[PDB]
Symmetry: D2
Subunit: 221 residues, 4 copies
Amino acid sequence: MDKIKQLFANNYSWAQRMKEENSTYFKELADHQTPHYLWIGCSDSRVPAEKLTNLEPGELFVHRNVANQVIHTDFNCLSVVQYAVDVLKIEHIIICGHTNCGGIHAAMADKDLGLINNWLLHIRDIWFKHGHLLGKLSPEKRADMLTKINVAEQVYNLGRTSIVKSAWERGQKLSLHGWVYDVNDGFLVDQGVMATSRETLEISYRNAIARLSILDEENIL
Amino acid sequence: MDKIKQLFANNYSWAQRMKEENSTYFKELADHQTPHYLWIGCSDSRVPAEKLTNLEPGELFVHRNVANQVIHTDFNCLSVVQYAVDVLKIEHIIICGHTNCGGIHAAMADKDLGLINNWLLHIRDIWFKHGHLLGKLSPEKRADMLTKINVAEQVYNLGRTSIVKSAWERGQKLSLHGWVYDVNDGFLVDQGVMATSRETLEISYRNAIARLSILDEENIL
Amino acid sequence: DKIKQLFANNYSWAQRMKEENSTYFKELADHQTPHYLWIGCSDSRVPAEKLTNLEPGELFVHRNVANQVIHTDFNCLSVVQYAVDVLKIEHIIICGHTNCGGIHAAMADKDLGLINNWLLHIRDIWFKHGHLLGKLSPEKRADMLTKINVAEQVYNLGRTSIVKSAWERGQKLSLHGWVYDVNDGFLVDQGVMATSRETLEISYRNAIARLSILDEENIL
Amino acid sequence: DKIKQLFANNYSWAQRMKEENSTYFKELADHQTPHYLWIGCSDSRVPAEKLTNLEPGELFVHRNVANQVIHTDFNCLSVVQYAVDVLKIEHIIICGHTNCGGIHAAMADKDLGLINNWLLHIRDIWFKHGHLLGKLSPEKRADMLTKINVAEQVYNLGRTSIVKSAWERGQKLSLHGWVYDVNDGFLVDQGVMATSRETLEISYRNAIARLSILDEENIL
Ligand SMILES: [Co+2]
Ligand SMILES: [Co+2]
Ligand SMILES: [Co+2]
Ligand SMILES: [Co+2]
């Protein structure tokens, strides 16, 4: 209103300032025609992907949804992956989770929020998968563990899609990554699930969970 | 590989450089706990939303999919909207399209791409909706018109979801926007579909199409 | 109580069968793989087995509100890819019905909740033919929409990557769109019938054109 | 040819009915609104009408591969919200079947295409019970998975916002999970039966525990 009019003014000021400087930005960008990374992050979008990775303009192909999920039967996410992998021939897909995630917390609370709750049931199913692990943890540290287990689970989901299986069976080079950053520092931490094939997917996911299962005593009660 | 290791180095360099400067960035961000805008853009993600709008960190709630679609029965997009509107109480949803869009072009070509084609059928259905308009145009200008008609159609879809209808029937303040930017300049151009209610949705969408239907003769053959 | 009735009915039926030495279950298992995919409405007014008098297990069945093949519905598309790629079914039939609650719900202004999102595809279809349906007597609209809806769903299925790929590799696959009137149960072809991309384009445009000729008793 | 057969059968059937002055269509229309939602498998080995001997139009029906209620499937959730919110159906039944191709497909290593994504939910379910199913003789696994799958689907439906909201507002809604053996057609309750969140939690955990006791003839 005031806000939208501002936004257009902000934008104009920027775009025009880019003209009055014949700015290479839109030239540099158009030369990176095709992205090299598919980035699956959360709609929370706290610290922008472009800022975490400092990749140049147009390098990232991006999907965001609530709590950075790759649901087995989500047409939306799968289309993005199939297009990225089969059409764009992208060789890295990054799933990025983040701490203090609204979806993670909502998946965890009892409030019935409406339609989103259904979306969040998959995180709840995951929470239950590692219920022993998570109840062996401090209530105020659970959201953070769950965020990481989530990322690891989402990578495992990604690597089980028929799109990714079929890209690997057919020879394509494709690596899967699962990372989290603390919103207070923005350090990307690899969660351990990294696959370039079906066998490394399974070995890698089992190892990551095993690794997540050794608790620092500053996490236990 | 080399690329991923680089990314982590880039990221480390950034995050650490943010420490050695006790940088307010992550403090400022955490004070914008809740977003004020839902931004539905394309996974192409050419010019980042944060750069178009120059909004401060954490202000945007973001969804991206191929060709910035709001499909009536997409659980993924709808969850993002229902969460944004009902939980986050966001009062502006922006659908942003962009020129030279990979999905737009793919929707337009005959190549069978696999799974993504199904996703793109909705754009094809739209292309057919304005077939008279678009065949009354220069072949090299069609993708650009289709990009804009798309945005306008997606806003019209958004404003017809039960989530948005029900937010309006129940008194909530919610405005819908549909914009495109040229990837060569980044000027956000409003496409005319702007609604704050069901009646302004319909009036606004009819007017936008009517307006799109008057051609400059530098667009006609 | 309602459930107790249903277990009882079920027991009476399945025992009536065991003690009779019923060849039914035996005969059902000798038909391991179906030959038709039938995509119908959840209203399911008269069952596909009654309409088609097919041998048990010949039908692979998907039902959803108003018998849609929505471009991006994982569920129906999963059913289709499995019937086509895996089960090698060579006939997919979409079958509407008159007096379809799904069709009536799509046209009413009422705000019903989540199902309205599902039915917005129908509304998009009603708009594409708003001229025709608008040249028509409003009380006859639902029945025309029932039929147009079926024709669009066949056009939709014919355009799925799954069907196109089945056709590009020589697989024999044909698509059908039928409606039956709930008052007599007769299966009426709606004219869209495809065995290929080209035949899909032609009968579709043909079906619509033939649907768009209104009887002057209904014309506005 | 296969289609000509089906129109012929259909004509013979619906005419047999008209000339007989069949009370069937009349009686069908006096049952405008169904009372059960039935979520079944597309394999559709024996039809819900045969299993339940219900009066025509009592069943509102959704079928998909392996009878799933997937948390985020618009299609099934559209069927459920419409049966529950709009049609006021007070019974939702999920019904598995033994010798389910969907269940067999989920367990096989084979890469079948898009349908494998659909079946990954089943695999997640198989893993959740991999201990139990792993304590079990491999050739008996599919039948146990058929039954566990049904129990998880009821647990899934019981957790949808739609069912929870129907329960939070006092609406009478109960959920059922049944399996029938394709060799005899008997409807067997799998123990998860819910009329509320609390009863959902208890019978679910109860059903699994009772499913997890293996007959020593099958124990590893
Ligand atoms: Co988040
Ligand atoms: Co684009
Ligand atoms: Co119907
Ligand atoms: Co089955």
